[model samples]
Target chain A: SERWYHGHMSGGQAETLLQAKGEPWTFLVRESLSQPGDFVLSVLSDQPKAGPGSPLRVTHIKVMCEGGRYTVLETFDSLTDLVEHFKKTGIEEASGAFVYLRQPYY
Target chain B: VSSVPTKLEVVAATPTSLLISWDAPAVTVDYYVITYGETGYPGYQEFEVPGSKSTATISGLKPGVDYTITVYAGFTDQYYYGSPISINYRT
Candidate 1:
């Protein structure tokens, strides 16, 4: 069963969640440590492997409300793509980010 | 003999590359080697990093493919290799 774990978004915490083969879905949010307003939202999932041509499964959806506006960032298809984005340009360089994992079923 | 590195992570990933990192072992480590292959494929690629460093970025991957990646610790003088830690991910 998937569980919840709290950790820093960029370092060991993220790794721990990545190494968790037992968990299927994880939702994590990252906030800039040094810069207050920067944020990154991610969803990790291990859905039934679909064909490359199949529409990427919509594992989860995230929305944020700030300053009276509710907007949704792009929804990702898998943990692989999500983590890849997290590495390339999703994270804060200096302060890193906070990470949280939530497996819905329990 | 070198012990396995702790907390291996695929820290960064892209269509063609993956950045991996780990915590140093309590024992002396000279270098680390990473081997990976697509699932159901026999051929794999290997990457090496110095012990003084804790991270390596593997590139030239085919996007949209699933791969099994393994990381191992090695000692130069003793010529020993530690147990490996592995994971499956998409590229």
Candidate 2:
């Protein structure tokens, strides 16, 4: 596929994969076992302000799908649209920490 | 004259989240404000949604914990509003 949707992977595994890449802003989307019809966006962030300054960590974000639309803070018509949106404007983690979408981890 | 949203539903979408929804009240309103907190706790968060949507999901919750979700429907502030509806659930 031309996208970063992993389809199936445990949260811990997702975290490990992203951390292995160790690149700031690298991200991937995977299915959420905790909720059906929903997904999780696991991205590696190197922003020291976020935490674990020495070693970056993966931030797991919930993507809600209603009817067929996907919502990642903002609602999009499709999952790709949601990912593309965040590509330009970084995904905000906390008050000032935003994860830029530099590379997509397949 | 006052009315409240009926058939308010709360389902655990995940161990850390909840999908909340409700039927439109007979009384016309503008938008809705949803506030939730751990019962008997001091921390809470508020989310405002347009009246057009009868559903919303609140995330980042603790599993197996008590929470109170309240839905408030009203017109523009300083205008008209209805009594708020609330429900207790575990997530």
Candidate 3:
């Protein structure tokens, strides 16, 4: 039986979602650089290739820490740039889940 | 009666759960009804939280699956639905 609070999937799951088209995608970071339970939510959309190989397009970002002090970033031109920052900050722990927006309700 | 909660956001997300927060409405808020599920699925489950709280955490979600979350403000008369917020995560 799966625990309610525990995660369910493992390796290679995120990559599959990243390559999917036509739907919104999300990546969650369960632990942040500074805290054990901090979270970073990243929303992405795969756009038409700039040429042949292009970086993923990021639409939104949200960082939540203790005490409900959170910041949301909704204006992103490129996910590559934002990911670079995450890597530099040691916050790109891709140990979360991938989300696909399949519902049509607004 | 209360107005719809504004600035609704996903404060935290994991492979199995999401924590959402929103600004309180102008009037008295009695409670909140949260509905969630995978996109294209209408068998969405529901939950609730006290009005005094501004945040709610939803669990028992599938890892790496996208889910649509809709929140409603419970008033004395009826529930007022807000725009849905979608999120996903991995373990």
Candidate 4:
């Protein structure tokens, strides 16, 4: 029944799932540990981690839930709509990382 | 809430029945309401099916005719939250 969303898994765990695949564009959404009603969209990016010497790692984007809608960069009515939107057009990180969504972890 | 079920298809078979199948929607739903009848006609018969099941066979129908079959997703005992998906098939 889990096509894309993985509510039971943690963000770090999902990062491992993406890392196991080791594909840069693999992504998954999980419930945010810090924020109960919000979610975390975890993506393994080609962009390096802490240091330039760091390996390509997962980026966690907090999907904030405000006024009953979900917003990452753009606000969407539902998680399905938001996932679909980002899949078609990649999201750009503030530091100039363009994250293209190519695969779903679950 | 669950989204509308997708990829609805019918495996053609016996004169009076058809096997319908589809993929599950976004979230879990309570059950599925399947209604089918002659094409371009009013008054269709409905069948209630469990949400866990992805396929249903509708019978007590006529043969050699065109019909429209629609499946509506039910959630928390409430329907119409998700749109109904439909496919046209013949007996």
Best candidate, lDDT-wise?
2
User: Residues B1-91, candidate 3, lDDT per residue (tens digit)?
Assistant: 2356765778788888888887777767677766565654322344567889888887767777767776666654532233333343332
Model 4 lDDT tens row, B20-49: 898888878787777675665422444468
Candidate 4 CA-lDDT value: 0.71
Encode model 1's per-residue lDDT on A1-106: one tens digit a residue.
1132122233223324433533534545443221233333433434332454332111212223356343334444443344445444432211122222343222
DockQ of the two-chain complex in candidate 4? 0.01
Weakest 10 consecutive residues, lDDT, candidate 3 chain A?
A1-10
Residue pairs clashing in model 1 are none
What tens digits encode model 4's per-residue C-alpha lDDT throughout A1-106? 1477888455446756876778788888877543468877777888554466665666666677889899873588888888788889776633334677788876
lDDT values of the candidates?
A: 0.50, 0.72, 0.45, 0.71
Per-residue lDDT of candidate 2, residues B1-91 (tens digit)? 3567887897447888899988888977687877676675422345468889899998777778778888877566433346778888987
For lDDT, candidate 2 versus 3, the one ahead is 2
Candidate 3, residue A79: CA error in Å? 47
Report per-candidate TM-score of chain A alone: 0.32, 0.86, 0.33, 0.83
Q: List residue ranges in candidate 3 displaced over 4 A.
A: A1-106, B79-91
Cα shift from native, residue B69, model 4 (Å): 55
DockQ of 1: 0.04
Worst 10 residues of 2 chain B by lDDT: B38-47
Off by over 4 Å in 1: A1-106
Off by over 4 Å in 2: A48-54, B1-91
TM-score of each: 0.43, 0.51, 0.40, 0.48
Residues B1-91, model 1: lDDT tens digits: 2366777788989998898788888888787766666664423444467888988877666788787777777666542357677778888
Model 3: docking quality category: incorrect
